[PDB]
């Protein structure tokens, strides 16, 4: 698990999956759920871990001129999870009207999904 | 190099570094540069490679209920490269007025940096 | 039309609608289409136009301390167009696997939609 | 003020400025500040308001084929505020390591700026 970590309890009512920036929002929703007696854990996929230190170091160390190009990525981890493992996660929490959902909105959807 | 790949020629006038969505734009700037007799290569950092297939499979396979949470990430690879390798890339191409730059804009900045 | 502008010819085979950062990519797809004898225009929705200069000036001019908070927005203009005008645009070009589409990809989808 | 609204009290210790998705996060930071006896208001710049209903309706109503193109925008409102009004907001809360800041982080920076 240099590449993915399961945060929380092994068994849980809900297993969230995310990567990147939504980690913190989910971890708070986990704490709020405990208050209602609902358990949840988080499978967190790490982006650049473990880092290729030696490889990057030996490429850049001999370069004439290096230009870092600012970049970004948006995704549901479900697509790549399905690709690699064959599991198709049917439930998802997507962005809501041009922004990520709030913790209260995430909590809301999460319970809805639980009760579905 | 399951984690980073150097695309193009080992030696080049310019070594671009990126990850995620700007890969394709850079690769075209590489082709445009050749036209002016400028060589460039691309150190591309891969996000979820190699994927933790077995680990993810065994977490999700026993879960009661899985909820994938759509997410995103924005970054200059320079920060993490410096953290891990100690190399501080001084030249960068950032987002320009609320969007990624165009290929022509990237080409422009790239030559400016070359001639600096 | 301080708030929306129609760029190109009044009548066209395809009318693109966008706002924000995809303006430039569309305008190039327009030029590529001409090469194949396909006409296209662009209804461009402007974000902060005309700007509330006087109102903003008189709020900020008397403030003790101002803190600008960097922000963002992601959307299909179709939702708000439907809300306001009742027109439901059925065809759309969405983001493709974690990035905006390339001009060639946009061109491709555009022709597909034309021929549908 | 179909185009910008000042939410909260006219006078305040801190005047936040934002647009788009960070509206909700700021409004909560406002409530948290009250708890410490700090007042704050929010100058909120509206994106597509008032909407050009008639103009859009009459363009799209006669179109052969309409294709909505999903788009996005990232910005500090400071740039355009300076352009239009000549006020240069010196204090800012930017994105922190690849994500928007949390409410606690925003609260933190806000107080730091207050005490600077």
Coordinates of C-alpha atoms in Angstrom, one line a residue:
Chain A
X1 CA 0.0 0.0 0.0
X2 CA 2.4 2.6 -1.1
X3 CA -0.3 3.1 -3.8
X4 CA -3.6 2.9 -2.0
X5 CA -4.5 3.0 1.7
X6 CA -7.7 2.0 3.4
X7 CA -8.4 4.7 6.1
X8 CA -10.7 3.7 9.0
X9 CA -12.1 0.4 9.9
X10 CA -11.8 -2.7 7.7
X11 CA -15.6 -3.4 7.8
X12 CA -17.9 -0.4 7.5
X13 CA -21.4 0.4 6.5
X14 CA -20.1 2.6 3.6
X15 CA -16.7 2.5 1.8
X16 CA -15.9 5.8 0.1
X17 CA -13.4 5.8 -2.8
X18 CA -11.6 8.9 -3.9
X19 CA -8.2 10.4 -4.9
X20 CA -6.8 13.9 -4.9
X21 CA -8.6 16.9 -3.5
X22 CA -11.8 15.3 -2.0
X23 CA -9.9 13.3 0.6
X24 CA -10.4 15.9 3.4
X25 CA -14.1 16.4 2.7
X26 CA -14.8 12.6 2.9
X27 CA -12.8 12.2 6.1
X28 CA -15.0 14.8 7.8
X29 CA -18.2 13.1 6.5
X30 CA -16.8 9.9 8.1
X31 CA -16.7 11.7 11.5
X32 CA -20.2 13.1 11.1
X33 CA -21.5 9.6 10.2
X34 CA -20.2 8.2 13.5
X35 CA -22.4 10.6 15.3
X36 CA -25.5 8.9 13.8
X37 CA -24.0 5.4 14.5
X38 CA -23.0 4.9 10.8
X39 CA -19.5 3.5 10.1
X40 CA -17.6 4.4 7.0
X41 CA -14.1 3.9 5.7
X42 CA -12.1 5.5 2.8
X43 CA -10.1 3.7 0.1
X44 CA -7.8 6.4 -1.0
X45 CA -5.9 6.1 -4.3
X46 CA -2.5 7.9 -4.2
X47 CA -1.5 9.7 -7.3
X48 CA 2.3 9.8 -7.6
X49 CA 3.3 7.3 -4.9
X50 CA 5.8 5.9 -4.4
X51 CA 7.5 8.6 -6.4
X52 CA 10.1 7.6 -9.1
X53 CA 12.9 9.6 -7.3
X54 CA 15.9 8.0 -9.0
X55 CA 14.4 8.0 -12.5
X56 CA 13.3 11.6 -12.4
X57 CA 16.5 12.6 -10.8
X58 CA 18.7 11.0 -13.5
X59 CA 16.5 12.5 -16.4
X60 CA 16.5 16.0 -15.0
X61 CA 20.1 16.0 -13.7
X62 CA 21.5 15.9 -17.3
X63 CA 18.9 18.1 -19.0
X64 CA 19.9 21.3 -20.8
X65 CA 16.7 23.1 -19.9
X66 CA 13.7 22.0 -17.9
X67 CA 10.2 23.6 -18.2
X68 CA 7.5 22.4 -15.7
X69 CA 4.1 22.7 -17.3
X70 CA 1.3 23.3 -14.7
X71 CA -1.5 20.7 -15.2
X72 CA -4.7 19.2 -13.8
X73 CA -7.0 16.1 -13.8
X74 CA -10.7 15.4 -13.2
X75 CA -12.1 11.9 -12.8
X76 CA -14.3 9.4 -11.1
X77 CA -12.0 6.7 -9.8
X78 CA -14.7 4.2 -10.9
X79 CA -13.6 4.1 -14.5
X80 CA -10.0 3.0 -13.8
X81 CA -11.1 0.7 -11.0
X82 CA -13.4 -1.1 -13.4
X83 CA -10.7 -1.2 -16.0
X84 CA -8.2 -2.9 -13.7
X85 CA -10.3 -5.0 -11.3
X86 CA -13.5 -5.6 -13.1
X87 CA -15.5 -4.2 -10.2
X88 CA -18.2 -1.7 -11.3
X89 CA -19.1 0.7 -8.4
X90 CA -22.7 1.6 -9.1
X91 CA -23.1 4.4 -6.6
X92 CA -21.3 7.8 -7.1
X93 CA -21.2 11.3 -5.7
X94 CA -20.5 13.7 -8.6
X95 CA -19.9 17.4 -8.7
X96 CA -23.2 19.4 -8.1
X97 CA -24.0 22.5 -10.2
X98 CA -20.4 23.6 -11.0
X99 CA -18.8 22.9 -7.6
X100 CA -17.9 19.9 -5.4
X101 CA -20.7 19.2 -3.0
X102 CA -20.6 20.5 0.6
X103 CA -20.0 18.1 3.5
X104 CA -23.7 18.3 4.4
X105 CA -24.6 17.5 0.8
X106 CA -22.2 14.6 0.7
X107 CA -23.5 13.4 4.0
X108 CA -27.0 13.7 2.5
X109 CA -26.3 11.7 -0.6
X110 CA -24.3 9.1 1.3
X111 CA -27.3 8.3 3.6
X112 CA -29.7 8.3 0.6
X113 CA -27.4 5.7 -1.0
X114 CA -27.2 3.7 2.2
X115 CA -31.0 3.6 2.5
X116 CA -31.5 2.8 -1.3
Chain B
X1 CA 9.4 3.3 -15.6
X2 CA 6.0 2.1 -14.7
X3 CA 5.7 5.5 -13.0
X4 CA 7.4 8.0 -15.3
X5 CA 8.3 7.8 -19.0
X6 CA 10.7 10.0 -21.0
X7 CA 9.0 10.5 -24.4
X8 CA 11.2 11.6 -27.3
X9 CA 15.0 11.8 -27.6
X10 CA 17.3 11.4 -24.5
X11 CA 19.1 14.6 -25.2
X12 CA 17.0 17.6 -26.2
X13 CA 17.2 21.4 -26.3
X14 CA 14.1 21.5 -24.0
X15 CA 12.8 18.9 -21.5
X16 CA 9.1 19.5 -20.7
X17 CA 7.7 17.9 -17.5
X18 CA 4.0 17.4 -17.0
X19 CA 1.3 14.9 -15.8
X20 CA -2.4 14.6 -16.4
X21 CA -4.2 16.5 -19.0
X22 CA -1.4 18.7 -20.6
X23 CA 0.3 15.7 -22.0
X24 CA -1.3 16.0 -25.5
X25 CA -0.8 19.8 -25.9
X26 CA 3.0 19.3 -25.0
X27 CA 3.4 16.5 -27.5
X28 CA 2.1 18.7 -30.3
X29 CA 4.4 21.6 -29.2
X30 CA 7.3 19.1 -29.5
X31 CA 6.3 18.4 -33.2
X32 CA 6.0 22.2 -34.0
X33 CA 9.5 22.8 -32.5
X34 CA 11.1 20.2 -34.8
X35 CA 9.9 22.4 -37.7
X36 CA 12.2 25.2 -36.4
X37 CA 15.0 22.7 -35.7
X38 CA 14.4 22.7 -32.0
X39 CA 14.4 19.4 -30.2
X40 CA 12.4 18.7 -27.1
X41 CA 11.5 15.7 -25.0
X42 CA 8.8 15.1 -22.3
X43 CA 9.2 13.6 -18.9
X44 CA 5.7 12.4 -18.2
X45 CA 4.7 11.5 -14.6
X46 CA 2.0 8.9 -14.5
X47 CA -0.7 9.2 -11.8
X48 CA -2.0 5.8 -10.8
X49 CA 0.5 3.5 -12.4
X50 CA 1.1 0.7 -12.0
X51 CA -2.3 0.4 -10.5
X52 CA -2.8 -1.5 -7.1
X53 CA -5.1 -4.1 -8.8
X54 CA -5.0 -6.8 -6.1
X55 CA -5.2 -4.4 -3.1
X56 CA -8.2 -2.5 -4.5
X57 CA -9.9 -5.7 -5.7
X58 CA -9.6 -7.3 -2.2
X59 CA -10.9 -4.1 -0.4
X60 CA -13.9 -3.6 -2.7
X61 CA -14.7 -7.2 -3.1
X62 CA -15.8 -7.5 0.6
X63 CA -17.4 -4.1 1.0
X64 CA -21.1 -3.7 2.0
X65 CA -21.5 -0.6 -0.1
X66 CA -19.1 1.4 -2.2
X67 CA -19.5 5.1 -3.2
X68 CA -17.1 6.5 -5.7
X69 CA -16.5 10.3 -5.1
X70 CA -15.7 12.3 -8.2
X71 CA -12.5 14.3 -7.6
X72 CA -9.8 16.5 -9.2
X73 CA -6.2 17.8 -8.8
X74 CA -4.3 20.9 -10.0
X75 CA -0.5 21.2 -9.6
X76 CA 2.9 22.1 -11.0
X77 CA 4.9 18.9 -10.8
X78 CA 7.9 21.1 -9.7
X79 CA 6.8 21.1 -6.1
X80 CA 6.8 17.3 -5.7
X81 CA 10.0 16.9 -7.9
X82 CA 11.8 19.3 -5.6
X83 CA 10.5 17.5 -2.5
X84 CA 11.7 14.1 -3.7
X85 CA 14.8 14.8 -5.8
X86 CA 16.1 18.2 -4.6
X87 CA 16.0 19.6 -8.2
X88 CA 14.3 23.0 -8.4
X89 CA 13.0 23.6 -11.9
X90 CA 13.2 27.3 -12.3
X91 CA 11.2 27.7 -15.6
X92 CA 7.5 27.0 -15.7
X93 CA 4.5 27.4 -18.0
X94 CA 1.4 28.2 -15.8
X95 CA -2.3 28.7 -16.7
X96 CA -2.9 32.0 -18.5
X97 CA -5.9 34.1 -17.6
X98 CA -8.3 31.4 -16.4
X99 CA -7.5 28.7 -19.0
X100 CA -4.5 26.5 -20.0
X101 CA -2.4 28.2 -22.7
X102 CA -2.9 27.4 -26.4
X103 CA -0.2 25.4 -28.3
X104 CA 0.9 28.6 -29.9
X105 CA 1.1 30.3 -26.5
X106 CA 3.0 27.3 -25.1
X107 CA 5.3 27.3 -28.1
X108 CA 5.9 31.0 -27.6
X109 CA 6.8 30.7 -23.9
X110 CA 9.0 27.7 -24.6
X111 CA 11.1 29.7 -27.1
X112 CA 11.3 32.7 -24.8
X113 CA 12.6 30.4 -22.1
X114 CA 15.0 28.8 -24.5
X115 CA 16.4 32.2 -25.5
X116 CA 16.5 33.5 -21.9
Chain C
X1 CA -25.3 42.2 -26.5
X2 CA -23.1 43.4 -23.7
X3 CA -23.9 39.9 -22.3
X4 CA -23.9 37.5 -25.2
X5 CA -22.4 37.8 -28.7
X6 CA -23.0 35.7 -31.8
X7 CA -19.6 35.3 -33.5
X8 CA -19.7 34.3 -37.2
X9 CA -22.5 34.1 -39.7
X10 CA -26.2 34.5 -38.6
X11 CA -27.2 31.3 -40.3
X12 CA -24.9 28.3 -40.0
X13 CA -25.0 24.5 -40.2
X14 CA -23.9 24.3 -36.5
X15 CA -24.3 26.8 -33.7
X16 CA -21.9 26.2 -30.9
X17 CA -22.7 27.6 -27.4
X18 CA -20.0 28.1 -24.8
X19 CA -18.7 30.5 -22.2
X20 CA -15.3 30.8 -20.4
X21 CA -12.2 29.0 -21.5
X22 CA -13.5 26.9 -24.5
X23 CA -14.1 30.0 -26.6
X24 CA -10.7 29.7 -28.4
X25 CA -10.9 26.0 -29.1
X26 CA -14.4 26.4 -30.7
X27 CA -13.3 29.3 -32.8
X28 CA -10.5 27.2 -34.4
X29 CA -13.0 24.3 -35.0
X30 CA -15.1 26.9 -36.8
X31 CA -12.1 27.6 -39.2
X32 CA -11.4 23.9 -39.7
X33 CA -15.1 23.3 -40.6
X34 CA -15.0 26.0 -43.4
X35 CA -12.3 23.8 -45.1
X36 CA -14.8 21.0 -45.5
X37 CA -17.6 23.5 -46.6
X38 CA -19.4 23.4 -43.2
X39 CA -20.5 26.7 -41.7
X40 CA -20.6 27.2 -37.9
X41 CA -21.2 30.2 -35.6
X42 CA -20.7 30.6 -31.8
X43 CA -23.1 32.0 -29.3
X44 CA -20.7 33.1 -26.6
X45 CA -22.1 33.9 -23.1
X46 CA -20.0 36.6 -21.4
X47 CA -19.4 36.1 -17.6
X48 CA -19.0 39.4 -15.9
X49 CA -20.1 41.8 -18.6
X50 CA -20.9 44.6 -18.5
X51 CA -19.0 44.9 -15.3
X52 CA -20.7 46.6 -12.3
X53 CA -17.8 49.2 -12.1
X54 CA -19.6 51.9 -10.0
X55 CA -21.2 49.4 -7.5
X56 CA -17.9 47.5 -6.9
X57 CA -15.9 50.7 -6.7
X58 CA -18.2 52.2 -4.0
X59 CA -18.2 49.0 -1.9
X60 CA -14.5 48.4 -2.0
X61 CA -13.6 52.1 -1.7
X62 CA -14.9 52.3 1.9
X63 CA -13.9 48.8 3.1
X64 CA -11.5 48.4 6.1
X65 CA -9.9 45.3 4.6
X66 CA -10.5 43.4 1.3
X67 CA -9.6 39.8 0.7
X68 CA -10.0 38.4 -2.8
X69 CA -10.8 34.7 -2.8
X70 CA -9.6 32.8 -5.9
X71 CA -12.4 30.8 -7.3
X72 CA -13.7 28.6 -10.3
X73 CA -16.7 27.3 -12.1
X74 CA -17.5 24.3 -14.3
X75 CA -20.8 24.1 -16.3
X76 CA -22.7 23.2 -19.5
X77 CA -24.4 26.4 -20.5
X78 CA -27.4 24.2 -21.4
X79 CA -28.8 24.1 -17.9
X80 CA -29.1 27.9 -17.5
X81 CA -30.2 28.4 -21.1
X82 CA -33.1 26.0 -20.5
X83 CA -33.9 27.7 -17.1
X84 CA -34.2 31.1 -18.7
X85 CA -35.4 30.5 -22.2
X86 CA -37.1 27.1 -22.2
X87 CA -34.9 25.8 -25.0
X88 CA -33.4 22.4 -24.3
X89 CA -30.2 21.9 -26.3
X90 CA -30.0 18.1 -26.9
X91 CA -26.5 17.9 -28.3
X92 CA -23.5 18.5 -26.2
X93 CA -19.7 18.2 -26.2
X94 CA -18.6 17.2 -22.6
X95 CA -15.1 16.8 -21.1
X96 CA -13.5 13.5 -22.3
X97 CA -11.6 11.3 -19.8
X98 CA -10.4 14.0 -17.4
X99 CA -9.5 16.8 -19.9
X100 CA -11.3 19.0 -22.4
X101 CA -11.4 17.4 -25.9
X102 CA -8.8 18.4 -28.5
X103 CA -9.8 20.5 -31.6
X104 CA -9.6 17.3 -33.6
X105 CA -11.9 15.5 -31.1
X106 CA -14.3 18.4 -31.0
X107 CA -14.3 18.6 -34.8
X108 CA -15.0 14.8 -34.8
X109 CA -18.0 15.0 -32.4
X110 CA -19.3 18.1 -34.2
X111 CA -19.5 16.2 -37.5
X112 CA -21.0 13.2 -35.9
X113 CA -23.7 15.4 -34.4
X114 CA -24.2 17.1 -37.8
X115 CA -24.7 13.7 -39.5
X116 CA -26.9 12.3 -36.7
Chain D
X1 CA -27.2 44.9 -8.3
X2 CA -28.4 42.4 -10.7
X3 CA -24.6 41.9 -11.2
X4 CA -23.0 42.1 -7.8
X5 CA -24.5 41.8 -4.3
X6 CA -23.0 42.7 -1.0
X7 CA -24.1 40.0 1.5
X8 CA -24.0 40.9 5.2
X9 CA -23.4 44.2 6.9
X10 CA -22.4 47.3 5.0
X11 CA -19.4 47.9 7.4
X12 CA -17.3 45.0 8.4
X13 CA -13.9 44.1 9.7
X14 CA -13.3 42.0 6.5
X15 CA -14.8 42.3 3.1
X16 CA -14.4 39.0 1.2
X17 CA -14.8 39.1 -2.7
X18 CA -15.5 36.1 -4.7
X19 CA -17.6 34.6 -7.6
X20 CA -18.6 31.1 -8.6
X21 CA -18.1 28.1 -6.4
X22 CA -16.4 29.6 -3.3
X23 CA -19.5 31.5 -2.3
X24 CA -20.7 28.9 0.2
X25 CA -17.3 28.3 1.9
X26 CA -17.0 32.1 2.5
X27 CA -20.5 32.4 3.9
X28 CA -19.7 29.8 6.5
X29 CA -16.4 31.5 7.4
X30 CA -18.5 34.6 7.9
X31 CA -20.6 32.7 10.5
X32 CA -17.5 31.3 12.3
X33 CA -16.0 34.8 12.5
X34 CA -19.0 36.2 14.4
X35 CA -18.3 33.6 17.1
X36 CA -15.0 35.4 17.7
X37 CA -16.6 38.8 17.5
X38 CA -15.2 39.5 14.0
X39 CA -17.6 40.9 11.4
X40 CA -17.3 40.2 7.7
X41 CA -19.3 40.8 4.6
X42 CA -19.1 39.3 1.0
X43 CA -19.1 41.2 -2.3
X44 CA -20.3 38.5 -4.6
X45 CA -19.9 38.9 -8.4
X46 CA -22.6 37.2 -10.3
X47 CA -21.5 35.5 -13.6
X48 CA -24.4 35.4 -16.1
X49 CA -26.8 37.9 -14.4
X50 CA -29.1 39.2 -15.5
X51 CA -29.3 36.6 -18.2
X52 CA -29.8 37.7 -21.9
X53 CA -33.0 35.7 -22.2
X54 CA -34.4 37.4 -25.3
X55 CA -31.1 37.5 -27.2
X56 CA -30.3 33.9 -26.5
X57 CA -33.8 32.8 -27.2
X58 CA -33.9 34.5 -30.6
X59 CA -30.5 33.1 -31.7
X60 CA -31.2 29.5 -30.7
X61 CA -34.9 29.5 -31.8
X62 CA -33.8 29.8 -35.5
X63 CA -30.7 27.6 -35.4
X64 CA -30.4 24.5 -37.5
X65 CA -28.4 22.6 -34.9
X66 CA -27.2 23.6 -31.5
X67 CA -24.2 22.0 -29.7
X68 CA -23.5 23.1 -26.1
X69 CA -19.9 22.9 -25.2
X70 CA -19.1 22.2 -21.5
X71 CA -16.7 24.7 -20.2
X72 CA -14.9 26.2 -17.1
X73 CA -13.1 29.2 -15.7
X74 CA -10.6 29.8 -12.9
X75 CA -9.7 33.3 -11.6
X76 CA -9.0 35.8 -8.8
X77 CA -11.6 38.5 -9.2
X78 CA -8.8 41.0 -8.3
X79 CA -7.6 41.1 -11.9
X80 CA -10.8 42.2 -13.4
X81 CA -11.7 44.5 -10.4
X82 CA -8.4 46.3 -10.9
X83 CA -9.0 46.6 -14.7
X84 CA -12.5 48.1 -14.3
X85 CA -12.2 50.2 -11.0
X86 CA -8.6 50.8 -10.5
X87 CA -8.7 49.3 -7.0
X88 CA -5.9 46.8 -6.4
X89 CA -6.8 44.3 -3.6
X90 CA -3.5 43.4 -2.0
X91 CA -4.7 40.5 0.1
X92 CA -5.8 37.2 -1.4
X93 CA -6.7 33.6 -0.5
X94 CA -5.4 31.4 -3.3
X95 CA -5.8 27.6 -3.8
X96 CA -3.5 25.6 -1.5
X97 CA -1.6 22.6 -2.8
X98 CA -4.0 21.4 -5.5
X99 CA -7.3 22.1 -3.8
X100 CA -9.4 25.0 -2.5
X101 CA -8.6 25.7 1.2
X102 CA -10.8 24.3 3.9
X103 CA -13.1 26.6 6.0
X104 CA -10.7 26.3 8.9
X105 CA -7.8 27.1 6.5
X106 CA -9.7 30.1 5.1
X107 CA -10.6 31.2 8.6
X108 CA -6.9 30.9 9.5
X109 CA -5.7 33.0 6.6
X110 CA -8.4 35.6 7.1
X111 CA -7.4 36.2 10.7
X112 CA -3.7 36.3 9.7
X113 CA -4.6 39.0 7.1
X114 CA -6.7 40.9 9.7
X115 CA -3.8 40.9 12.1
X116 CA -1.2 41.8 9.5

